[PDB]
Write a protein that binds this ligand. Structure first.
Ligand SMILES: CS(=O)(=O)N1CCc2c(c(-c3ccc(Cl)c(C#Cc4ccc(CNCc5ccc(Cl)cc5)cc4)c3)nn2CCCN2CCN(C3CC3)CC2)C1
Length: 219
């Protein structure tokens, strides 16, 4: 029996909204955000993890292209293979591709595995968000309405289920009975509601929010 609303910010599992600047690293921000929640769940500590670590080090071997895009799933695999990821403080974000400068001295988190969810299943995504934690997802953000979003529940008739932007589902609920996913973006505080966007939920995988969900775990 799933709760009617969740918001992982109220459980203290979500770090502040980041600003990716001129670097297509949304995939890296989505991935670290998910792992940040699990790190807090396991250890009690909330620490921002290094998106730049992923940009610089999870590259061609993982199908990732730094500031030209990438995938959260293969980002998690990098963290597994690498046996760690650095804190954001120690490996700060520069919004550009750099040489890999991972240093295990400043390792703030580990990843044992990750799980993908089945394509288009908003019911399964809801369960995972309720029971596991924030979930990394892709959305179709290729529409001016997305970029211009300020408040309310986002609905874009010309959205597709193809995804081109990584974000973090940190919750769900309804606004006056209009169901939504609570989504943490990485375009700073001036995007949406202090960096957050409510996106239509249970409208047939609107903007592909449930097309490619994934979350990591730490044992
Ligand atoms: C079409 S589809 O939706 O059907 N789909 C096709 C199939 C697909 C899509 C996504 C997916 C899921 C989540 C996200 Cl987030 C993304 C993404 C993204 C993205 C794209 C562009 C940008 C950059 N934006 C423009 C920009 C450029 C430069 C700058 Cl500086 C600034 C901005 C950022 C993020 C993709 N997973 N899979 C399935 C897995 C695909 N692989 C992953 C790894 N492989 C290689 C073996 C390594 C095999 C399989 C997309």
């Amino acid at each position: 029996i799933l709760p009617d609303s969740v918001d992982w910010r109220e459980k203290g599992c979500v770090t502040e909204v980041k600003y990716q600047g001129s670097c297509g690293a949304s995939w890296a921000f989505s991935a670290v955000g998910a792992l940040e929640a699990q790190l807090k769940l396991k250890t009690g500590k909330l620490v921002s993890l290094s998106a730049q670590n992923l940009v610089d080090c999870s590259t061609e071997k993982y199908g990732n292209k730094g500031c030209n895009g990438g995938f959260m799933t293969t980002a998690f695999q990098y963290i597994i293979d690498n046996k760690g990821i650095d804190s954001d403080a120690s490996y700060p974000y520069k919004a550009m591709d750099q040489k890999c400068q991972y240093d295990s001295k400043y390792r703030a988190a580990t990843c044992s595995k990750y799980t993908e969810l089945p394509y288009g299943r908003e019911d399964v995504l809801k369960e995972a968000v309720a029971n596991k934690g924030p979930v990394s997802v892709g959305v179709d953000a290729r529409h001016p309405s997305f970029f211009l979003y300020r408040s309310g529940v986002y609905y874009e008739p010309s959205c597709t289920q193809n995804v081109n932007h990584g974000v973090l589902v940190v919750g769900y609920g309804d606004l006056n009975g209009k169901e939504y996913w609570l989504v943490k973006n990485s375009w700073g505080h001036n995007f949406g509601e202090e960096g957050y966007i409510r996106m239509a939920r249970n409208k047939g995988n609107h903007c592909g929010i449930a097309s490619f969900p994934s979350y990591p775990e730490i044992l």
